[PDB]
Ligand binder design. Structure first.
Ligand SMILES: C[C@]12CCC(=O)C=C1CC[C@@H]1[C@@H]2[C@@H](O)C[C@@]2(C)[C@H]1CC[C@]2(O)C(=O)CO
Ligand SMILES: C[C@]12CCC(=O)C=C1CC[C@@H]1[C@@H]2[C@@H](O)C[C@@]2(C)[C@H]1CC[C@]2(O)C(=O)CO
Ligand SMILES: C[C@]12CCC(=O)C=C1CC[C@@H]1[C@@H]2[C@@H](O)C[C@@]2(C)[C@H]1CC[C@]2(O)C(=O)CO
Ligand SMILES: C[C@]12CCC(=O)C=C1CC[C@@H]1[C@@H]2[C@@H](O)C[C@@]2(C)[C@H]1CC[C@]2(O)C(=O)CO
Lengths: 122, 125, 122, 120
């Protein structure tokens, strides 16, 4: 029922910036995890837990301080802002969501996935 | 030399969302604080959120009153600072001004900031 | 080269007032059109032509006498003062600029655009 | 929305070769023009249709330059052979969803900063 669709990716030079988006539709309920994963040439990049009351955000150590996850709730859109891009950031960036997760960064805890948007860092 | 220009302000219903932007130009140097302050008529400026950027990577700071509702981010290639607001409350109403400085002992001390934009108004009804 | 930054929209009741602003930066040149368009999921609302020596102002018939366009050349800012707002004024209002245009309201001739500010009149 | 970044330029002797690259990212849509300009003269462009492409060259570079694009890598190439001194310039890539004349720079909505080519 929950549908996720990513956009905004592409090819960028090392050191560059990029902002990815993912739109959500369907009966999500009010609380859960909304996350970005990357499949490089499937690791958790960043995630936000929305409590439905506030919010908690998590980052992978390799992107801390370079990436920012945010969301516009009125627009049902999740964002991944990327700065200081490195070649090892290359991959298919997929958004995922779930009502319940133990590890925010474990892909198998997520029940809804988008197809992804490719990011290739020169 | 450093110039800051905010945009994206507007009117919103309580519970709504809004994203502010600020573009910088000029000789900033590579390191320092980039912050959002808010001020209502007759009130003192209150630090909302800030980032500290090092020579490389950034750290982020939030006022307790906006934590978990506002998110600060920047796009360095676009020289732009963002404030994503969600779950807006009437008490978030104010003139939102972006500020920057190479040097600040504490992120929320407006007296330490050296460049200021004119601001963009956010009204929450 | 040219960047357009908008502000000032949002929610208001019918009969209300809103004041849109757009700040321009970059290499614009000295003459041309500076316009407001409204986009629903782009029709011209108002524009100014600056000949760089005085200006001329243009309005869509449906906003004449309710909206006023003005510009501060010192602050490089364009304003749209919207009084007596009606529900049909609802839309995404985007600023646009161009050196040449066959008609002020022909958005296809405008190459520089702002992201938009949403205006919702209940 | 659309971010274009060129690379591959520099200083080269007449008669030499160079391959410029431009990477694109962001929400582009599926159809439009992707072009190389030198400064502002149209050098070469490719139109990609919804189906699948059409390519155009300035008369002064026909038979010497080739434009191509790797759609999987979101990269536009300008292969320059038999370079001449009048090819010197700042080569900028541009893109747009629609244009009447592929070579008219004023019709393009997105621009890169460019890569300099100096032919001695
Ligand atoms: C993570 C979440 C719940 C768990 C899930 O499987 C899918 C998602 C992604 C979208 C999130 C959603 C909930 O948190 C409520 C949210 C924030 C929504 C976007 C807008 C929203 O509907 C609200 O803001 C409700 O007020
Ligand atoms: C806080 C800072 C330094 C202190 C100052 O007075 C003004 C600013 C705001 C813009 C920041 C800048 C530096 O950090 C370098 C930054 C990040 C820049 C935006 C893009 C940038 O120029 C770079 O990314 C260069 O690497
Ligand atoms: C429409 C125009 C030229 C065409 C274009 O693509 C972008 C714009 C909007 C900003 C205008 C500009 C020119 O007219 C010169 C202006 C008025 C400028 C704001 C202040 C200005 O720079 C001056 O007043 C210079 O005297
Ligand atoms: C010219 C175009 C559309 C108009 C625009 O402002 C930016 C460009 C450059 C990149 C092109 C794009 C579209 O044509 C779809 C393309 C080909 C894309 C490269 C890979 C692509 O996304 C696809 O291959 C879709 O199948």
């Amino acid at each position: 029922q929950v549908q996720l669709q990513e956009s905004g990716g592409g090819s960028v030079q090392a050191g560059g910036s990029l902002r990815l988006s993912c739109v959500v539709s369907g009966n999500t309920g009010s609380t859960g995890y909304w996350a970005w994963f990357r499949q490089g040439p499937r690791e958790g990049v960043a995630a936000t837990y929305t409590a439905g009351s506030t919010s908690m955000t998590y980052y992978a150590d390799s992107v801390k301080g370079r990436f920012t996850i945010s969301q516009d709730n009125a627009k049902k859109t999740l964002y991944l802002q990327m700065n200081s891009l490195k070649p090892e950031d290359t991959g298919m960036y997929r958004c995922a969501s779930t009502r319940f997760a133990g590890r925010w960064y474990r892909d198998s805890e997520y029940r809804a996935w988008g197809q992804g948007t490719q990011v290739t860092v020169s």
